[PDB]
Amino acid sequence: QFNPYGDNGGTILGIAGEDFAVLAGDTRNITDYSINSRYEPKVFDCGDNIVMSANGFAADGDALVKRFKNSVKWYHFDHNDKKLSINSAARNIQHLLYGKRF
Amino acid sequence: AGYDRHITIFSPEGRLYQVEYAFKATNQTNINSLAVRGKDCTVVISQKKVPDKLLDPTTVSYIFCISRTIGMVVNGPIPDARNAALRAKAEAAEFRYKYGYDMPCDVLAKRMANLSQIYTQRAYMRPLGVILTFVSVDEELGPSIYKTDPAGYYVGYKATATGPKQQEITTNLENHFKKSKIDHINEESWEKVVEFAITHMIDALGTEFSKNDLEVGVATKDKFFTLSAENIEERLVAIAEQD
Amino acid sequence: TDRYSFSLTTFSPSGKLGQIDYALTAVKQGVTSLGIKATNGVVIATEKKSSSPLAMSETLSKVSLLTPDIGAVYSGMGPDYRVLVDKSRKVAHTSYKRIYGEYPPTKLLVSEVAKIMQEATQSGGVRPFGVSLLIAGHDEFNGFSLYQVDPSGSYFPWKATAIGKGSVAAKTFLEKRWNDELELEDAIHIALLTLKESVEGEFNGDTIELAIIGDENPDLLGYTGIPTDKGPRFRKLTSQEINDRLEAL
Amino acid sequence: GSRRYDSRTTIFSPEGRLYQVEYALESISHAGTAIGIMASDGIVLAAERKVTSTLLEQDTSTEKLYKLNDKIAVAVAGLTADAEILINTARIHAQNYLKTYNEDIPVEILVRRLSDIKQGYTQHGGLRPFGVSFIYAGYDDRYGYQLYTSNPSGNYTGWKAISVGANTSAAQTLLQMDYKDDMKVDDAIELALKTLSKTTDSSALTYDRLEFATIRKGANDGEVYQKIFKPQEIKDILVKTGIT
Amino acid sequence: DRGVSTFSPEGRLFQVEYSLEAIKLGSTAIGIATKEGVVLGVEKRATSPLLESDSIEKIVEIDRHIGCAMSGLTADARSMIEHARTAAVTHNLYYDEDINVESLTQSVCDLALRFGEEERLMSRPFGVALLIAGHDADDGYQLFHAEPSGTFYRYNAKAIGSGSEGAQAELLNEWHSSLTLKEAELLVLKILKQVMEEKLDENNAQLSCITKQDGFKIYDNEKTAELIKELKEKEAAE
Amino acid sequence: MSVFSPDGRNFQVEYAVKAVENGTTSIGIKCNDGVVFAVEKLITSKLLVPQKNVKIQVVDRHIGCVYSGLIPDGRHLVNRGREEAASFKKLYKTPIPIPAFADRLGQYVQAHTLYNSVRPFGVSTIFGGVDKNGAHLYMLEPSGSYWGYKGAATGKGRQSAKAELEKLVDHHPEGLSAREAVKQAAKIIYLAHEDNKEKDFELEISWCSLSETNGLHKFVKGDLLQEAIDFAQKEIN
Amino acid sequence: RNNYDGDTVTFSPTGRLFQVEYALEAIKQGSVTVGLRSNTHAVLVALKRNADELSSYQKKIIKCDEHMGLSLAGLAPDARVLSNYLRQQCNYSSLVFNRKLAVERAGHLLCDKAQKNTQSYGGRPYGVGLLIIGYDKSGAHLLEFQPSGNVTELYGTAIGARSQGAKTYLERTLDTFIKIDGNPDELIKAGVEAISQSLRDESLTVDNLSIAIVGKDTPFTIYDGEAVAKYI
Amino acid sequence: SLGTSIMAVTFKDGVILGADSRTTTGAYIANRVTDKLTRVHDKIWCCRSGSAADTQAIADIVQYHLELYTSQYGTPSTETAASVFKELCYENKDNLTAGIIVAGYDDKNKGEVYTIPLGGSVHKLPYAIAGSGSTFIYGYCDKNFRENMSKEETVDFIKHSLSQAIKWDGSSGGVIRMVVLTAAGVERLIFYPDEYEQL
Amino acid sequence: GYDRALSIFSPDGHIFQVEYALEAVKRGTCAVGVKGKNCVVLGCERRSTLKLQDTRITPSKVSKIDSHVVLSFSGLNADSRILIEKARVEAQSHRLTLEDPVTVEYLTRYVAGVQQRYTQSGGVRPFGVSTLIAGFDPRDDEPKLYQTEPSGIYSSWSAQTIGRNSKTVREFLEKNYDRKEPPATVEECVKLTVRSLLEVVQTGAKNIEITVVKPDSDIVALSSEEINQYVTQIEQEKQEQ
């Protein structure tokens, strides 16, 4: 049967400081024992001082990043260029992810 | 003042003015047609009038090859004619696919007549301003001529004619069959039936023709085909020995 | 896209349904047609009027078979009739035969036809049909019967009747000649008399279409081996039989 | 420009009257008269076939009086075609109620449901209403014998005696005069005919012009019987009443 | 007759213009903006004494930080509030934050031109106008007028209904860059008292505000009653 | 619309024709291994970017279309044209034959004359190209009527042009090489501009030729476009 | 006109869609706005109307993508519906083709979206006019959009009531502004003057005036109020 | 299903299609005289393999398409016909088991052969072989196919290649049919066992 | 498919179909409602009698939505059936999801909601019906009465009437009902209600019917004689004066 999922590995790390925050990921993308790229960026600036990474099945992660970035873009159009609060952004993402609950 | 004039609904006299007007629209081309049956073939003729030197004359035609065996000629504006042609082509191809044999002339007539009838009942759709004259050498029935109009009426024919001089041509033919005393042109060759047909049009219209003043479609067992200006010139060249 | 989703046939102040009146008017102008009930059959008939002698009246079922024991005739708009025959035959199967394994009885099929005719009086985006029908048939539990159907969707049974041009004049004729003893061949005869008044050009078997619902026709089933299937009660007469009959009269 | 033809069948008049509804009644007014009379021990239905010829066929008919179920029947006034559409759905509603609850449908429940339908064509859809006015004669075990009427408006009312169709104005006067609560079914059959006898636009009221029906017990234990009088049964009844 | 979304030769939508005509006939409603809050007030206009004068709600809460007053065929406004309330709660749910008042208004206005024959099932425009007042943290206190034309405008003060031009003019004059909340409360009361046919009192008028502090509150008949007698006394002295 | 007047014609189509006549002129000339399309573009103001309001459209890779009348209708027709030419190809593999294509538009335009809740097209479209066996020039009215053509023109200066065409047909029955037809058309657009000479006008020419464009449809540009404009300016002055 | 202007699906005896023409009137009664451009930038200057002194001024400018945006005059809601349509096309071209939508192409699309309302029944033609600017792979662009479906490319132009004055001033200024290449603030002043020519009654100030510009290295941005003071 | 032994070979004057005659269901031979040569148009034929139900239903629907096409665009190319087959086979990969060879004659192109295997892919070729029995003649066919052959030679080539397929493949057997397609019309041949076995 | 816009604005700013719909309500048999300290009463005029009709089964003007709420109407009978069905459903659906019957204001709102959707939807005309909806919220004693129109507008009332001659009887009540002194008893209340109708009825207990709603699903329809004790009493009380 066709399995729609896959695993590109990778590891990502998020830490919050007092007046700063980091989001780090390794650069290596894979399939089983093969390497697909020693440099394939996983962490993304999405505007409004938000960075994100969707580790795991890089296809689903790419999809998700594209959507959220675009969500930002529409939040600006739809709500008078308001900056998207980190919490407001977190909520948005929950809705994105839950849309594909099944 | 109106309303029963614009949609397909009865007047107090019991008439659908829209259908009557669809009939007018059939003469708009100012072209006449006729069809006759041979001993084993069917011939139709329509006048060809290319008045403008810009038109590529070889694309001006009111006769169509619907099926391999069924040919149709139309009296009326070209857009409607194409509309009806395409539909009849589709129908004959579909009928073939579902029933395992070629759709026969009379059945297609009935089919198309039934669609024209629908436009008669429904308000939103107008009837087509045409008269469809289907011909074939039917496998069960032999040479066939069935023609439908905008009212959804259709009927078989020994021979028939349509257009601005429908009446003139029609009586020329009736007469001939009263004399001959038969329902067809007792000829073995189709070329002679064609010749007969052209002859009797010249006689009923009082006009003589060039090779580019006519269109001729002929139906034979297993094929319906239309002649070139060359296959016509030969016909004419021969009907010029006839006296 | 059909934007005509509203009725085109509506109640007037006087209470009339205009478009129906007008369909009836369209029937008056149609060629006279008639039906006559006998004790062992029914005869329905009409004139096969073709304008051009080049036309082939043979290729015109003014009289049509709906089932093997049921037949129909009209007066009015022929195209509207030709489609009701196709609808009637189809409902005859889909709504009845494909369930019960028997053909509908006369009255019920008449009910179906009339149903289709009514919907046209009320659906949106249509005029009613411009025909009046006469339907003759025989069913096992009702004997022979004859019904008339109008544009309204209304219908009724008759011992004998006529519709169209001669309708007024013809019905008079029939009132005088009809009795409960009439044995089919006698009814056929009358029909040919009544109709002789309406017709005005030629009057013979090729200008007359006539059909009967009578005995069963084994020679016309097309197969044998099922003692219990007995052939259709409907028989259309051949011109060669009309004329023989005329030669009497 | 499709909208030029929309007659707007479901609209109010400056006065708050539905045109098409009123106009439909005007139609019904011209229809053959039909009457319903309720006794204590039964119900009667009578009707006058509008037109007749000597040639019309009576014995195999049913133009004005149709049967809905075993305990319920209606008399018609207006287009017969329209009536059959509505009758057919009514015969179904009866069956659905039966199949569902295993009890014959209570008369009002059916009458309402059907009246609710006519009212549909009165408020939405842009279709002409039904040119039919019904008289419902039925019996159930909550109210017993019942008599209802519904018109194109979608409105229904209950009655002891009622008429619909032609010359009602006159009919109601006579029913008011001779109707009484104790009335027995036989007396109601009598009245039902004497009334039509005075309203007929015909010169005389014969059996071939009529159609008659009765819902009572008949003399079968606690059983209810419906009876669509046959032509001979109607003539036998007219001789007794004193109208050979 | 001639279609619903038809244009006049002056390029107006007959229905939208005929809609505005129905609004002119509506009860009055005024709104005044300030750095301390926004105040909305209305004319109840009870067609008979018998009618229980407080079942008349022409000022409703849309969310804790937004209120709105209406004018005209008020029945039509039920759909609009329902949508506005949904829109505001939905937004809260998708973003864990309050909807900006403009945004909320722009959502209501979209709804307004969705009529005719996107998937616009609605036969005619709304026959009602709305003052929409609230506070967001980006553009503080705000008032909007939302016509059935789909357009809206932001106002420092605005009236709609029967006495709107007389009250708009009177508002033009009386509104300044720095009124307190309590000054505004009074001008509403005053200006209502001018244009209403009836003698303004606590039963034929209602008053409400929306402060960042306590959000949207409708002043009970008691509290407003005191403000009326605060006017009569403020007016008495000169 | 779909309403016959008592004379058998459909007045709404007849009016859509008025719209077309109000149009700028456009033409087509068939040559011995292709076709050439040309159109006048009125300069409403000196603010139009010259050469940037292209009105000749391409269908598939081998068909060009040009119209006069309601420009948007024209596009709406070429949009259906492209959808239709893709369909045919997808299934049948070959790029759509011209006559087949001409009927695909002819059936669709005609479709818009059958219902009284849809208005017919307000353009007369000249199109054509090169297929499996020859070149074809077609012109299509709001009626749904269409025919093959040696030459064609529609719009305001429609006769001025038809006259110039009837001469090329007569005084050149051998053929007319693509390059000649390009210049010849340019001249015809300049002459036809006499009727509607109120405003200044921009020339636009496309061509589809088996030898010159290898069968594909292309826009006569730069140098070859200058010769054409030159050639025309000589027979005005 | 009685019969022929009842709906959009109807041609007058003279070949005219009356409703379409009537919807152009709303534009002619719309508050003026102007567009003009060089090779490095494109500017939208737009006069804003207001209902009262207590009213705000309604925005005549809407952004469509990072490199494109427009100006309006006529019905605001129709500008919203069309600028929202436009926002999606730019977005679709980005998302699916990682490609910025070409200014020229947006014109073709708004032309096709408007044309369907002039042919279909039940629907009215749009009642708004639009000026669109953008820097695409081929430079700076300005388009004039009309409800009829007629989009046109230009160096400059104006729409709205009184727009005729500013349009004529641009016919003259042409050879100067075309070349305000590499100069942002000068191109804005040039547009800002053009707008004055169709002014009449009032005189542009902070609240009235609205300005937008896109260009070679300048993402499309709008300026209103204090930010436009520098140009009055 | 036709399981099958089928081939189509282009030669100098046009092309010849050839096929065995046997259709099996299990080990029982349902029909030993099957005409695996199917006509979709006068001079455009196909040979079918895999599910009969499917291959027939397809041939039938293509024919219909080619017939309607003929009615309105004149005659279709062998290419246009192959395309229609593939559009059906590909767009329904999930519900079909059909491997069809398409062979036809244009006057301009003379003989053409398009093979359409399970996927729904298309490959134009000089000759093609398919069916259960084709695995055994890959070796033979390739070694003996020669381009621009005489008609006499092409018939021998098919008759030999098929005789071998029949020999080894139990799923293939019967008579050997062939259809010839040239400018001179359409010819139909047949070779009985007593003949082809003796090679 | 039929969505023609039947309810539309006219130059003056009115929707004539909503108004012609009120014209139909003014045609209807009068309907009235008044609330006491602890009860609510509904009254309804009924044409004549009539000597040949059957009353037991034939639709009686007051309908029960739930066991604690009722509805009364003037105007098209056929229409009111539709609002009663929908209302009776929303009642039981409310119970099913909120586990509490409707409040009188909630039900009233729902009905007026329908009435409005029919003034703004295509293919449909407004209801020729206006209503009085009365009852007691659950586990509540304070009486409730509300009125709804074809507009979809609703509002509460201490006393109200609608239908033919409603104007006469509102003027009567505007005088005969003190907000501070609302009919302390059932009897005191039913009296005022019988009297309000006696301007417009033209006979006694023959035409009048009364329905008395008291808290906790306590509703009873007075049978003619009891109504005729108030009629007997009112004609002799006015007499002495």
Quick check: helix, strand or coil at residue I139? coil
How long is chain I? 241
All residues at 6 or more sequence positions from B198 whose CB lies less than 8 Å from its CB, including other chains: B45, B209, B214, B216, B235, B236, B239
Which H or E run includes G91? helix G76-97
DSSP D153: T
Count of alpha carbons within 13 Å of D235, Cβ hemisphere only? 8
Q: Assign domain D1-244 to its CATH architecture.
A: 4-Layer Sandwich (3.60)
Least Cα distance to B197 among B167, B160, B143, B156 occurs for: B160
What token pair was written down for D188? Answer: 């109601």
Q: Which residues in chain B are contacts of H63 at CB distance < 8 A?
A: 97
All residues at 6 or more sequence positions from C80 whose CB lies less than 8 Å from its CB, including other chains: B117, B120, B121, B152, C129, C130, C131
Chains H and F lie in contact, requiring 3 or more CB pairs less than 8 Å apart: yes
Range of the domain at E169: 1-238
What token pair was written down for D244? Answer: 């050979």
Contact of D226 with chain C, judged by CB distance below 8 Å, is answered with no
H197/H162 Cα distance (integer angstroms): 10
Q: How far is CA I88 from CA D119, I128, I129, in A?
A: 19, 19, 17
G10/G2 Cα distance (integer angstroms): 12
- Report the number of distinct structural domains present in chain F: 1
Point out which residues pair with F38 in neighbouring strands.
F27, F205
Interior angle at CA F26, CA G115 and CA F79, nearest 5: 35
**Record: contact D123-I124, CB cut-off 8 A:** yes
CATH of the domain at E125: 3.60.20.10
What token pair was written down for A9? Answer: 């590995």
D208/D238 Cα distance (integer angstroms): 11
Q: Which residues in chain F are contacts of C3 at CB distance < 8 A?
A: 117
Least Cα distance to C131 among D57, D51, B112, B117 occurs for: B117
* Residue labelled with tokens 């029913």: D175
Amino acid at I208: I
Point out which residues pair with I209 in neighbouring strands.
I44
Quick check: helix, strand or coil at residue I75? strand
E43/E206 Cα distance (integer angstroms): 7
Q: Catalytic annotation on H4?
A: yes
* Residue labelled with tokens 């036309």: C55
Point out which residues pair with B233 in neighbouring strands.
none
Chains E and G lie in contact, requiring 3 or more CB pairs less than 8 Å apart: yes
A42/A27 Cα distance (integer angstroms): 7
Amino acid at B224: F
**Record: contact D5-B124, CB cut-off 8 A:** no
All residues at 6 or more sequence positions from I21 whose CB lies less than 8 Å from its CB, including other chains: D12, D16, I75, I125, I126, I127, I128, I150
What token pair was written down for F176? Answer: 């007319």
Amino acid at H9: V
B232/B191 Cα distance (integer angstroms): 9
* Residue labelled with tokens 């020729």: I128
- Report the number of distinct structural domains present in chain E: 1
Which H or E run includes F10? none
**Record: contact A80-E100, CB cut-off 8 A:** yes
Q: Which residues in chain E are contacts of G28 at CB distance < 8 A?
A: 11
Resolution (A): 3.2
B124/D90 Cα distance (integer angstroms): 33
Cβ contact D71:D146 at 8 Å: no
Quick check: helix, strand or coil at residue D115? helix
Range of the domain at B228: 1-243
Quick check: helix, strand or coil at residue G74? strand
φ/ψ of F188, rounded to 5, equals -65, -30
Cβ contact C195:C47 at 8 Å: yes
**Record: contact C6-D5, CB cut-off 8 A:** yes
- Report the number of distinct structural domains present in chain B: 1
What token pair was written down for G125? Answer: 């033609």
**Domains of chain D, residue spans:** 1-244
Quick check: helix, strand or coil at residue I212? strand
**Record: contact G87-A77, CB cut-off 8 A:** yes
CA dihedral C191, C192, C197, C203 (to 10 degrees): 150
Angle formed by the axes of helices D107-118 and I77-98, nearest 10°: 110
DSSP E83: H
Q: How far is CA G125 from CA E1, F15, G23, G149, in A?
A: 19, 19, 7, 9
CATH of the domain at B60: 3.60.20.10
Least Cα distance to G61 among G44, G49, G77 occurs for: G44
Residue G210 exposed, middle or buried by CB count within 10 Å (0-12, 13-18, 19+): buried
F74/F39 Cα distance (integer angstroms): 14
Nearest Cβ partner of I174 from E23, E48, E122? E48
Per DSSP bridges, beta strands C209-213 and G33-37 are unpaired
Best residue in I46, I54, I82, I85 to probe D by mutation, most D CBs within 10 Å? I54
All residues at 6 or more sequence positions from E133 whose CB lies less than 8 Å from its CB, including other chains: E31, E33, E38, E39, E40, E66, E67, E68, E69, E101, E141, E142, E143, E144, E210
Contact of F118 with chain B, judged by CB distance below 8 Å, is answered with no
Least Cα distance to G146 among G21, G62, G51, G53 occurs for: G21
**Method used experimentally:** X-ray
- Dump the DSSP string for G203-230: ---TTTEEEEEEETTEEEEEEETHHHHT
φ/ψ of F114, rounded to 5, equals -90, -20
Cβ neighbours, 10 Å, residue I4:
22
What token pair was written down for H61? Answer: 């629907």
Cβ contact B3:D5 at 8 Å: yes
Q: For chain H, where are the alpha helices, taking DSSP H only?
A: 52-73, 78-90, 138-144, 151-168, 193-196
- Sign of the alpha-carbon torsion through C199, C200, C204, C206: negative
- Dump the DSSP string for H65-94: HHHHHHHHH-SPPHHHHHHHHHHHHHTTGG
All residues at 6 or more sequence positions from H157 whose CB lies less than 8 Å from its CB, including other chains: H9, H141, H144, H145, H146, H149
Interior angle at CA C58, CA C57 and CA C60, nearest 5: 70
Least Cα distance to F29 among F133, F157, F149 occurs for: F149
All residues at 6 or more sequence positions from G26 whose CB lies less than 8 Å from its CB, including other chains: E7, E11, E12, G74, G75, G127, G128
φ/ψ of D55, rounded to 5, equals -80, -20
What token pair was written down for F69? Answer: 């009348």
How long is chain B? 243
H159/H18 Cα distance (integer angstroms): 8
Q: What strand order describes the sheet that includes C155-157?
A: C64-67, C70-76, C131-139, C143-149, C155-157
CA dihedral B169, B175, B181, B183 (to 10 degrees): 20
Per DSSP bridges, beta strands B214-220 and B223-226 are antiparallel
Cβ neighbours, 10 Å, residue E8:
13
D130/D122 Cα distance (integer angstroms): 9
Contact of E97 with chain A, judged by CB distance below 8 Å, is answered with yes
What token pair was written down for I162? Answer: 């609608």
What token pair was written down for F196? Answer: 């509607």
Which fold is adopted by the domain H1-199? Glutamine Phosphoribosylpyrophosphate, subunit 1, domain 1 (3.60.20)
In chain C, the residue whose alpha carbon lies closest to the alpha carbon of F117 is: C3
CA dihedral H61, H64, H69, H72 (to 10 degrees): -150
Least Cα distance to C74 among C168, C170, C164, C173 occurs for: C164
Cβ contact H138:H168 at 8 Å: no
Amino acid at F135: A
- Report the number of distinct structural domains present in chain G: 1
What token pair was written down for C179? Answer: 């009795």
Cβ contact B58:F148 at 8 Å: yes
CA dihedral B202, B208, B211, B216 (to 10 degrees): -10
**Record: contact F162-B54, CB cut-off 8 A:** yes
Quick check: helix, strand or coil at residue F185? helix
Least Cα distance to F183 among F223, F138, F150, F211 occurs for: F223
Q: How far is H93 from chain B (nearest CA, A)?
A: 23
D56/D207 Cα distance (integer angstroms): 13
- Dump the DSSP string for I77-130: HHHHHHHHHHHHHHHHHHHHHHSSPPPHHHHHHHHHHHHHHTTSSTTB---SEE
Which H or E run includes F135? strand F134-140
E107/I20 Cα distance (integer angstroms): 34
Q: Which residues in chain E are contacts of A91 at CB distance < 8 A?
A: 93-96
Cβ contact B58:B115 at 8 Å: no
Cβ contact D28:D132 at 8 Å: yes
Quick check: helix, strand or coil at residue F171? coil
Cβ contact C72:C110 at 8 Å: no
Q: How far is CA C161 from CA C178, D62, H69, in A?
A: 10, 19, 53
Angle formed by the axes of helices D80-101 and D107-118, nearest 10°: 130
D166/D155 Cα distance (integer angstroms): 19
φ/ψ of D240, rounded to 5, equals -65, -40
Least Cα distance to I218 among I108, I139, I158, I136 occurs for: I136
Q: How far is CA F89 from CA F85, F86, F94, F95, H150, in A?
A: 6, 5, 5, 5, 35
DSSP D201: S
F214/F194 Cα distance (integer angstroms): 35
G58/G61 Cα distance (integer angstroms): 9
Q: What strand order describes the sheet that includes E29-33?
A: E157-160, E29-33, E38-43, E205-211, E215-219
* Residue labelled with tokens 């062992």: C40
Q: How far is D234 from chain C (nearest CA, A)?
A: 19
Range of the domain at F230: 1-237
F79/F57 Cα distance (integer angstroms): 10
**Record: contact F169-B54, CB cut-off 8 A:** yes
Q: For E42-163, where are the alpha helices, taking DSSP H only?
A: 77-95, 101-113
All residues at 6 or more sequence positions from C99 whose CB lies less than 8 Å from its CB, including other chains: none
Which H or E run includes F20? helix F11-21
Least Cα distance to B176 among B206, B196, B202 occurs for: B196
Strands (E), D143-206: 144-150, 156-158, 161-164
What token pair was written down for I83? Answer: 């609002």
